[model samples]
Target: DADSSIEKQVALLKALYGHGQISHKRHKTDSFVGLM
Candidate 1:
């Protein structure tokens, strides 16, 4: 079962990633679809 802490962390990471701040060089191939 996914705990609240884990879920929160995951959500935070997702938010950061959604902002396209994770990285640009690695995703330079295809890139993230973003929060759609």
Candidate 2:
């Protein structure tokens, strides 16, 4: 049970990390485009 819980947390963290990176890149793109 503990192992399963830890696995879920790791998966969630990885997903959030991926989403954060994606949004971060989009934010930079928007800023760059605004400057153009």
Candidate 3:
């Protein structure tokens, strides 16, 4: 269950980062980036 949860987190980050809402391209690999 934890693994799937982590996977979803990754997917969401990818989508957000791809959409240019994360502020930095490097954030794709920076897992600690704030979702706010």
Candidate 4:
């Protein structure tokens, strides 16, 4: 499903930051978690 695609991107960023790849990524993480 295309909705899975959305989570794919979300999961992507989640995985990215979860692994500490990028800085300032937490803002979106907060927003995404906030949106939830």
Q: Considering every candidate listed, which one attains the maximal TM-score? A: 2
* Residue-level lDDT tens digits of model 2 in 1-36: 676877778777777777678767767878788777
Give the alpha carbon lDDT tens digit for every residue of 1-36 in model 4: 677777768767777666664566656778777666
TM-score against native, each model: 0.30, 0.32, 0.29, 0.28
lDDT for 4 (candidate 1): 64
Off by over 4 Å in 1: 1-4, 21-36
User: Where is model 4 more than 4 Å wrong at Cα?
Assistant: 1-4, 21-36
For every model shown, the clashing-pair count is 0, 0, 0, 0
Residue 30 alpha-carbon offset, candidate 3, angstroms:
31
**Better lDDT candidate (1, 3):** 3
In order, the Cα lDDT scores of the candidates are 0.64, 0.75, 0.69, 0.68
Q: List pairs with backbone clashes in candidate 1.
A: none
Residue 11 lDDT in candidate 1: 69
Provide the lowest-lDDT 10-residue window in model 4. 17-26
Worst 10 residues of 1 by lDDT: 27-36
